[PDB]
Amino acid sequence: KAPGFAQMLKEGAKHFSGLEEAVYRNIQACKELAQTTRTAYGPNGMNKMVINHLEKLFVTNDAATILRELEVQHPAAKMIVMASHMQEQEVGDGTNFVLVFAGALLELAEELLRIGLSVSEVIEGYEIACRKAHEILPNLVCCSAKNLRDIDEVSSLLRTSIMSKQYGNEVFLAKLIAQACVSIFPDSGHFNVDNIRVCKILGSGISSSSVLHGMVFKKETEGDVTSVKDAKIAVYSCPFDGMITETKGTVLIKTAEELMNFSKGEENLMDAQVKAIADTGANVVVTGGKVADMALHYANKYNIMLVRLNSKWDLRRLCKTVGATALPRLTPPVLEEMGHCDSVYLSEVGDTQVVVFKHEKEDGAISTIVLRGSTDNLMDDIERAVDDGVNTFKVLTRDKRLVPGGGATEIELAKQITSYGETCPGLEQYAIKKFAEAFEAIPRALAENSGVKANEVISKLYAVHQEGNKNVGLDIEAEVPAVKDMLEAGILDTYLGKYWAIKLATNAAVTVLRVDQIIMAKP
Amino acid sequence: LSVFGDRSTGETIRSQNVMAAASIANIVKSSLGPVGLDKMLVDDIGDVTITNDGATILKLLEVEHPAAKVLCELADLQDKEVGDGTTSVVIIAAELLKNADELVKQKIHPTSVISGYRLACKEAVRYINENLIVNTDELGRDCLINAAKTSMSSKIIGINGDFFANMVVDAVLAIKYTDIRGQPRYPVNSVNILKAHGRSQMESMLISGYALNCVVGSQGMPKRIVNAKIACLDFSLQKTKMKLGVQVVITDPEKLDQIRQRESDITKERIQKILATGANVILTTGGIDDMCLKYFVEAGAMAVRRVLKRDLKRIAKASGATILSTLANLEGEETFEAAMLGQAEEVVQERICDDELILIKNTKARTSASIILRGANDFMCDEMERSLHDALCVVKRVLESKSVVPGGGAVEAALSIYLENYATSMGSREQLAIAEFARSLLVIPNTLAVNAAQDSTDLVAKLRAFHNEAQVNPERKNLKWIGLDLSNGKPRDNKQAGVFEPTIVKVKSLKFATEAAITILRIDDLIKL
Amino acid sequence: KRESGRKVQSGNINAAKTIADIIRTCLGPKSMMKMLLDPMGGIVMTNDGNAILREIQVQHPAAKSMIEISRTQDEEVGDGTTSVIILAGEMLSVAEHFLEQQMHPTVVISAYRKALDDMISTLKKISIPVDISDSDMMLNIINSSITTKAISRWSSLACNIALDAVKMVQFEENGRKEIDIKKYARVEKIPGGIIEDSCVLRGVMINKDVTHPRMRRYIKNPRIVLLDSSLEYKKGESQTDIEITREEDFTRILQMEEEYIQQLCEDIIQLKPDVVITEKGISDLAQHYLMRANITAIRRVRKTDNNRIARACGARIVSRPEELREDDVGTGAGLLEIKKIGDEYFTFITDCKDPKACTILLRGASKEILSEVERNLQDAMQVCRNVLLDPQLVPGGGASEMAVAHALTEKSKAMTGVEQWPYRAVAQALEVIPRTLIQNCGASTIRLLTSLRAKHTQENCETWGVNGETGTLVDMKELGIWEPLAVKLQTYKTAVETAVLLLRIDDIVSGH
């Protein structure tokens, strides 16, 4: 019966009418995305009881893990999530900056559209303010990395990135990752997170961790050989077990003596198979699955170092470094597809023997952080801090420029942008002023997660900045809502982290504002 | 069972009476303190009485429930006995019931709860009496100025509170009088507050005597009198009549002539009888005849006509003059010599802007004074009169009472630590009840903090810390008697700030609130007919 | 039943906001009309903000407070009432800081009361005095009401009536310069004539009818008498009626009725008066002596109506008629005329004196046109009252709102604390006044309101408002939209005081 739905003619999709504010609905999908991560922002971030797709329980506060597990189906939210994925490129931090800032730009845009300002004029203001923010951000650069490759320097600046992922233990992790990062910075112009690997081992606690060179593997050496300097490393994916012939190979056995004869024939064949490994000049062998009992002694017969890597990612980790690729057959003497390594030895650290691939002959630009923890979920959450911590200094290989943190830049950058909008006549000042208030959402996130009235933090942060006391941020404390200097406390953020975050967040917000109707299709 | 009514028993009857009393408290919880929020009162007709006073709300609050009516009957007991603290009573009694109802769910009988609350009130009154301050610090010390200053700071008078505070304290002590076995109280009828356009607020002067807004009229009379005799006649010397509702019927024209001539003649005896008494500072209520004013010029008497009834009422109480309504003693005429004459030392009509105010000095026994609020415009003089009138009763209530106690949740915060420690000494199914009595008192500083737009959890914790440190040791480094300042949102020592209350308020409010919760806790059943 | 918690303040806001949304478009000369469906299916197409809310039924008590406060405005000032409710609704419409930010109302109320003292100071800065001696300026000022009315054909007539009338009542010698239009400027209609015949009587006009022809028709030197008692037989202390059944007792009670009414009338005529004015009624026997004396019979004259007479002709009030001395004579009065002007008698006791009171004669061609001239003249008298009480005008057309808002926004920069946010929100609420003037004309609201705020920043704030008719910007120095100061100050206080009131409500309780 008429009048039915208005503006609904494309596959019956939910087309919001002019009264229902179709633009207001795509914004609400992005605001809900911020609330899921607004609480995890800062050192006092709240953890999320995430339930994996395998019905696994994980308690974490990392933004990338929340969104990867939260199936975001709304396309308007996917754009901001795609900015978070683009945030991971060129920098390894500032993900929640994209979610919190963009959510404030869209949330504040509704206050403009409700007044009657056109969406095309709102976009011009944010694009003007983003360009203006990039001019003010260099002026806020307080300190810069000396690049002395000092662990005292690298660990000091790294404390800010480690916090908000694993709080409280920022002293140990800053020293260890500093020891791992300093050992590669001499390799000028080649630093990457792929070199600094991580190996988690069940242990007492986080304090029992340390750093070791080479590609470390937690699985101890199964063989009886302690050390071997052989370059040819033969990697096989098929485990050491009862052979099967790719051709017919029909095996008929009737009597009990024939069972023993065929059993002996297999052991004589396996003795020849392991013999072929030593014939190809390779005293090292790797196995994915189980390892047989007789084949184990054959590895000790020719002093072939037996290696076990049950994890698939551990196998592929070696395929791209030493070159040894896994073949489908069980011990095919294929010497061409083997690897090359300078040193392979076993080492006991923290009361645990771990396989090591050290580069003694070669210069060496690879390391590994051996983490210890009494829970697998805890070590995984600490691993996420290593990536966000190591990637912080992959950015410092570029232009070394640090800015204050703790919401300090967000108020000064807002204060400088608000003045530009007050003196700028026209309609763009409305969206330029709201671009400054979007920055205030970040201190408001830190204050709310610390149990403090956020409005009192903004009032104090603006007063000290009115007097010219820059580099002043939120004092993280439950019983003290006052502020302190981020420079004296040593809290510092990266320049490129804020640059690419303000850029990608504005493009994601503008890209959502430019959209006014979601329409289905079919190929 | 079959009956002509309805019955309902069990623990839910206690809960129903608990939630009822808790509801009545929430109606007067946010309106607690001087910064309390107003509340509407929709009557049956449709009128809307808006007010924040808790006593005025409960008088008009109509909730048809028995438990609520018990607290309404309780309000009348506190209003008549003291006249203050009714709001804290209903709030304290509501928290004792909400806490006791939780104990009843822990298999604590109400009789054990009733016994604990009775002992807690006894010890609380003991700790209160042991930590009082007698009515003192009047002169030479500062147990006042800070009290009146903090009360008047709300208005525009708060620019210079010290200048106006001294005028209150000096006059509040000037109006002292024992009059019963060393009682001394102070009068509700207080120092008269006039005003003038004295070019600024700082020009207001404190007078040591009464000020009247009248003038003698003719300039022939003196303006500087020293005679002690003060006349006070309410009978007018002008043309007297039978009554406004009784017109003397007159028919003959000649009879109208001698009525005019005799009335003009009879006053010549009335004026000679009044002048013979020697009273110079004469005051007349019903006006004075024009020819009679001329007789005071030659005699030199300071007569004044059309004096207000109430302003003259205080002058008779000042000089002790017998107010006379008629000269005729039912057969003749006389001035009642040595009856309507007062006793004073000097009377001078000073020069004040736009109104020459007469000043009376050193009467027999007046216990009163006057202040002339010399200001810029009427808006400031009208506001300062309200501020001083409020602050006047603030210091009056303190010096009238024999003992006081630090307010602002200082008593409720101090008892929270003492009674909690006293509970560990008794035991015997009363340790929990006395502990809940201790926790229930914290609602007062917790409620006053919410109304003051501050974090109640922090300020209540800060009070209990300064009060607990007083219990650990008596060292002076530990602050003592710390109250709660609502404006600044921080604890403050009320002894310096002057935030005082009577002792009977905190004593009766804890006693009446305890008796009310006892009266409701004993109710375990309801029978309707 | 009742309301408690945050639901009350947010509920009072929606009620006050809803009442303001009704009359948002009833502002300015291009005001929009409203359709009021009567219960009988009828319609009234009025566009008056007071008349709309008067006929609408409201359930929330907060709406009754907003409406009742507007009625109090009409008694004092017959203009700007629509601006009170709109500002009070916009000041309350900012519920972000109220509840979503979890600020206490005392924090908001302290900011609203701080801004009010700043709004009052800023309006006096942009004010401008007026030369009240020159009536030409008051004509341009009073034309704010005469414009878009039928009386524009005699616009100058309405000014001279209202201007000179209030000047007579204005007793400046008492210092405060109080004016009472209700008492000392009593208005009475006269059928006959036209709009041009409307004038001001320099006296007091009593609408008493002529009961008998034996009354003074024209006099050059009236002599008016005043007394409160009734001219009738003296009854007892109680209201007991006299019941008689014996004929012999009739002549006794009758003689007492005649003699006392006879003797009292004999004293009234001893002074040789021309009219006997009594506060109470006059019986038939008492009128037989008035018609015999060839004097006019007047009765039912209130106290203040009689007080003006004694100041006009010089009469003297007496309790009873027996005590009438020679002083009670209206010597110097202009004339006494009871002529039937337009099928209705009218008592004229005009004179050449200004006894702190007057009476306006509303001549017209019909009752429809008379009532049109009547209601249009009362507002002109009030504008004269507001200007003469405080001769200071402020720029209208939304200029005073934007001028004040710039002062708060610049002053809030030095306001350290959380009160700066609601303090600035009050400034943005003043912008609603030009927001409605621009919405009614049809011009773009955002484009002009944006440029309007920029003009106040650079150029002087005393000008550059909005033209409601054209829609474009214009200086108030070039367009006489200047409004009084006392109307804007009371309009600003009543909006803040009303918003502070509803914000202080947190529990709508029932009980008596």
PDB file of N, CA and C in Angstrom, chain A residues 369-417:
ATOM      1  N   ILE A 369      64.919 -12.381  19.432  1.00  0.00           N
ATOM      2  CA  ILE A 369      64.613 -12.108  20.832  1.00  0.00           C
ATOM      3  C   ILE A 369      63.910 -13.338  21.388  1.00  0.00           C
ATOM      4  N   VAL A 370      64.548 -13.999  22.350  1.00  0.00           N
ATOM      5  CA  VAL A 370      64.016 -15.217  22.953  1.00  0.00           C
ATOM      6  C   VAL A 370      63.216 -14.800  24.182  1.00  0.00           C
ATOM      7  N   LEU A 371      61.890 -14.816  24.056  1.00  0.00           N
ATOM      8  CA  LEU A 371      61.000 -14.410  25.132  1.00  0.00           C
ATOM      9  C   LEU A 371      60.623 -15.610  25.988  1.00  0.00           C
ATOM     10  N   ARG A 372      60.480 -15.369  27.289  1.00  0.00           N
ATOM     11  CA  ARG A 372      60.072 -16.382  28.254  1.00  0.00           C
ATOM     12  C   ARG A 372      58.798 -15.926  28.947  1.00  0.00           C
ATOM     13  N   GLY A 373      57.840 -16.840  29.072  1.00  0.00           N
ATOM     14  CA  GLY A 373      56.585 -16.530  29.726  1.00  0.00           C
ATOM     15  C   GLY A 373      55.803 -17.771  30.103  1.00  0.00           C
ATOM     16  N   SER A 374      55.121 -17.726  31.246  1.00  0.00           N
ATOM     17  CA  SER A 374      54.381 -18.879  31.741  1.00  0.00           C
ATOM     18  C   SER A 374      53.026 -19.068  31.065  1.00  0.00           C
ATOM     19  N   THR A 375      52.698 -18.267  30.052  1.00  0.00           N
ATOM     20  CA  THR A 375      51.432 -18.379  29.342  1.00  0.00           C
ATOM     21  C   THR A 375      51.651 -18.017  27.881  1.00  0.00           C
ATOM     22  N   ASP A 376      51.074 -18.817  26.981  1.00  0.00           N
ATOM     23  CA  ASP A 376      51.221 -18.552  25.554  1.00  0.00           C
ATOM     24  C   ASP A 376      50.514 -17.263  25.157  1.00  0.00           C
ATOM     25  N   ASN A 377      49.361 -16.982  25.771  1.00  0.00           N
ATOM     26  CA  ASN A 377      48.644 -15.748  25.476  1.00  0.00           C
ATOM     27  C   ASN A 377      49.432 -14.522  25.918  1.00  0.00           C
ATOM     28  N   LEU A 378      50.230 -14.650  26.978  1.00  0.00           N
ATOM     29  CA  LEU A 378      51.004 -13.512  27.465  1.00  0.00           C
ATOM     30  C   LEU A 378      52.189 -13.221  26.554  1.00  0.00           C
ATOM     31  N   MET A 379      52.885 -14.265  26.102  1.00  0.00           N
ATOM     32  CA  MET A 379      54.030 -14.065  25.219  1.00  0.00           C
ATOM     33  C   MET A 379      53.594 -13.515  23.868  1.00  0.00           C
ATOM     34  N   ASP A 380      52.426 -13.941  23.379  1.00  0.00           N
ATOM     35  CA  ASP A 380      51.923 -13.421  22.113  1.00  0.00           C
ATOM     36  C   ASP A 380      51.617 -11.932  22.216  1.00  0.00           C
ATOM     37  N   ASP A 381      51.030 -11.504  23.336  1.00  0.00           N
ATOM     38  CA  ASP A 381      50.776 -10.083  23.536  1.00  0.00           C
ATOM     39  C   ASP A 381      52.074  -9.303  23.695  1.00  0.00           C
ATOM     40  N   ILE A 382      53.113  -9.937  24.247  1.00  0.00           N
ATOM     41  CA  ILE A 382      54.412  -9.285  24.346  1.00  0.00           C
ATOM     42  C   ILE A 382      55.093  -9.251  22.984  1.00  0.00           C
ATOM     43  N   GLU A 383      54.827 -10.249  22.135  1.00  0.00           N
ATOM     44  CA  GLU A 383      55.376 -10.238  20.783  1.00  0.00           C
ATOM     45  C   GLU A 383      54.842  -9.055  19.989  1.00  0.00           C
ATOM     46  N   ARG A 384      53.565  -8.716  20.177  1.00  0.00           N
ATOM     47  CA  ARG A 384      52.993  -7.568  19.484  1.00  0.00           C
ATOM     48  C   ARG A 384      53.669  -6.270  19.909  1.00  0.00           C
ATOM     49  N   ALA A 385      54.150  -6.204  21.152  1.00  0.00           N
ATOM     50  CA  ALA A 385      54.901  -5.033  21.591  1.00  0.00           C
ATOM     51  C   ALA A 385      56.269  -4.964  20.929  1.00  0.00           C
ATOM     52  N   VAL A 386      56.859  -6.117  20.604  1.00  0.00           N
ATOM     53  CA  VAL A 386      58.157  -6.125  19.940  1.00  0.00           C
ATOM     54  C   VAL A 386      58.035  -5.558  18.532  1.00  0.00           C
ATOM     55  N   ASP A 387      56.970  -5.925  17.816  1.00  0.00           N
ATOM     56  CA  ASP A 387      56.775  -5.417  16.462  1.00  0.00           C
ATOM     57  C   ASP A 387      56.545  -3.911  16.476  1.00  0.00           C
ATOM     58  N   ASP A 388      55.667  -3.441  17.362  1.00  0.00           N
ATOM     59  CA  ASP A 388      55.415  -2.008  17.469  1.00  0.00           C
ATOM     60  C   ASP A 388      56.612  -1.267  18.052  1.00  0.00           C
ATOM     61  N   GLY A 389      57.476  -1.963  18.789  1.00  0.00           N
ATOM     62  CA  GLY A 389      58.665  -1.350  19.349  1.00  0.00           C
ATOM     63  C   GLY A 389      59.816  -1.310  18.366  1.00  0.00           C
ATOM     64  N   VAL A 390      60.048  -2.422  17.671  1.00  0.00           N
ATOM     65  CA  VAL A 390      61.119  -2.466  16.681  1.00  0.00           C
ATOM     66  C   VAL A 390      60.793  -1.551  15.509  1.00  0.00           C
ATOM     67  N   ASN A 391      59.537  -1.557  15.057  1.00  0.00           N
ATOM     68  CA  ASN A 391      59.138  -0.710  13.941  1.00  0.00           C
ATOM     69  C   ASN A 391      59.224   0.772  14.277  1.00  0.00           C
ATOM     70  N   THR A 392      59.170   1.133  15.561  1.00  0.00           N
ATOM     71  CA  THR A 392      59.353   2.528  15.945  1.00  0.00           C
ATOM     72  C   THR A 392      60.732   3.028  15.541  1.00  0.00           C
ATOM     73  N   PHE A 393      61.748   2.168  15.649  1.00  0.00           N
ATOM     74  CA  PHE A 393      63.114   2.546  15.315  1.00  0.00           C
ATOM     75  C   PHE A 393      63.483   2.230  13.876  1.00  0.00           C
ATOM     76  N   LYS A 394      62.693   1.406  13.183  1.00  0.00           N
ATOM     77  CA  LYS A 394      62.803   1.341  11.732  1.00  0.00           C
ATOM     78  C   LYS A 394      62.440   2.678  11.102  1.00  0.00           C
ATOM     79  N   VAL A 395      61.569   3.444  11.760  1.00  0.00           N
ATOM     80  CA  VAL A 395      61.223   4.778  11.286  1.00  0.00           C
ATOM     81  C   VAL A 395      62.332   5.771  11.611  1.00  0.00           C
ATOM     82  N   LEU A 396      63.042   5.575  12.724  1.00  0.00           N
ATOM     83  CA  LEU A 396      64.121   6.481  13.095  1.00  0.00           C
ATOM     84  C   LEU A 396      65.350   6.325  12.210  1.00  0.00           C
ATOM     85  N   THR A 397      65.439   5.250  11.421  1.00  0.00           N
ATOM     86  CA  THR A 397      66.456   5.188  10.375  1.00  0.00           C
ATOM     87  C   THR A 397      66.216   6.260   9.320  1.00  0.00           C
ATOM     88  N   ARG A 398      64.969   6.696   9.168  1.00  0.00           N
ATOM     89  CA  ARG A 398      64.624   7.848   8.350  1.00  0.00           C
ATOM     90  C   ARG A 398      64.940   9.112   9.149  1.00  0.00           C
ATOM     91  N   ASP A 399      64.397  10.251   8.715  1.00  0.00           N
ATOM     92  CA  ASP A 399      64.587  11.518   9.415  1.00  0.00           C
ATOM     93  C   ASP A 399      64.220  11.398  10.893  1.00  0.00           C
ATOM     94  N   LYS A 400      65.206  11.642  11.754  1.00  0.00           N
ATOM     95  CA  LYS A 400      65.053  11.469  13.198  1.00  0.00           C
ATOM     96  C   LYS A 400      64.433  12.734  13.774  1.00  0.00           C
ATOM     97  N   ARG A 401      63.125  12.690  14.021  1.00  0.00           N
ATOM     98  CA  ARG A 401      62.393  13.818  14.582  1.00  0.00           C
ATOM     99  C   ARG A 401      61.356  13.278  15.553  1.00  0.00           C
ATOM    100  N   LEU A 402      61.483  13.657  16.821  1.00  0.00           N
ATOM    101  CA  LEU A 402      60.566  13.241  17.873  1.00  0.00           C
ATOM    102  C   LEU A 402      59.717  14.427  18.306  1.00  0.00           C
ATOM    103  N   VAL A 403      58.473  14.147  18.675  1.00  0.00           N
ATOM    104  CA  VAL A 403      57.548  15.164  19.171  1.00  0.00           C
ATOM    105  C   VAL A 403      57.040  14.696  20.527  1.00  0.00           C
ATOM    106  N   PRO A 404      56.554  15.613  21.369  1.00  0.00           N
ATOM    107  CA  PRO A 404      56.002  15.181  22.659  1.00  0.00           C
ATOM    108  C   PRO A 404      54.757  14.329  22.478  1.00  0.00           C
ATOM    109  N   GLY A 405      54.504  13.474  23.459  1.00  0.00           N
ATOM    110  CA  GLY A 405      53.351  12.596  23.485  1.00  0.00           C
ATOM    111  C   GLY A 405      52.388  12.946  24.598  1.00  0.00           C
ATOM    112  N   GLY A 406      51.629  11.945  25.040  1.00  0.00           N
ATOM    113  CA  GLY A 406      50.680  12.142  26.121  1.00  0.00           C
ATOM    114  C   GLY A 406      49.614  13.169  25.826  1.00  0.00           C
ATOM    115  N   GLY A 407      49.268  13.356  24.554  1.00  0.00           N
ATOM    116  CA  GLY A 407      48.297  14.359  24.178  1.00  0.00           C
ATOM    117  C   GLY A 407      48.826  15.774  24.137  1.00  0.00           C
ATOM    118  N   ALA A 408      50.142  15.962  24.245  1.00  0.00           N
ATOM    119  CA  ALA A 408      50.702  17.309  24.254  1.00  0.00           C
ATOM    120  C   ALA A 408      50.610  17.953  22.878  1.00  0.00           C
ATOM    121  N   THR A 409      51.061  17.243  21.841  1.00  0.00           N
ATOM    122  CA  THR A 409      50.978  17.776  20.485  1.00  0.00           C
ATOM    123  C   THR A 409      49.535  17.979  20.052  1.00  0.00           C
ATOM    124  N   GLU A 410      48.619  17.143  20.540  1.00  0.00           N
ATOM    125  CA  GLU A 410      47.233  17.218  20.092  1.00  0.00           C
ATOM    126  C   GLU A 410      46.566  18.511  20.544  1.00  0.00           C
ATOM    127  N   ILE A 411      47.007  19.080  21.667  1.00  0.00           N
ATOM    128  CA  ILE A 411      46.449  20.347  22.134  1.00  0.00           C
ATOM    129  C   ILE A 411      47.141  21.520  21.452  1.00  0.00           C
ATOM    130  N   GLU A 412      48.466  21.463  21.322  1.00  0.00           N
ATOM    131  CA  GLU A 412      49.189  22.538  20.648  1.00  0.00           C
ATOM    132  C   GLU A 412      48.831  22.595  19.171  1.00  0.00           C
ATOM    133  N   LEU A 413      48.794  21.438  18.505  1.00  0.00           N
ATOM    134  CA  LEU A 413      48.376  21.399  17.110  1.00  0.00           C
ATOM    135  C   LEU A 413      46.928  21.844  16.955  1.00  0.00           C
ATOM    136  N   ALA A 414      46.083  21.549  17.946  1.00  0.00           N
ATOM    137  CA  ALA A 414      44.716  22.055  17.934  1.00  0.00           C
ATOM    138  C   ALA A 414      44.683  23.551  18.211  1.00  0.00           C
ATOM    139  N   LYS A 415      45.524  24.018  19.135  1.00  0.00           N
ATOM    140  CA  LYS A 415      45.569  25.442  19.449  1.00  0.00           C
ATOM    141  C   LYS A 415      46.068  26.252  18.258  1.00  0.00           C
ATOM    142  N   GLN A 416      47.077  25.742  17.550  1.00  0.00           N
ATOM    143  CA  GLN A 416      47.604  26.456  16.393  1.00  0.00           C
ATOM    144  C   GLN A 416      46.630  26.428  15.224  1.00  0.00           C
ATOM    145  N   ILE A 417      45.874  25.339  15.071  1.00  0.00           N
ATOM    146  CA  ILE A 417      44.920  25.247  13.972  1.00  0.00           C
ATOM    147  C   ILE A 417      43.659  26.049  14.277  1.00  0.00           C
TER     148      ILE A 417
END
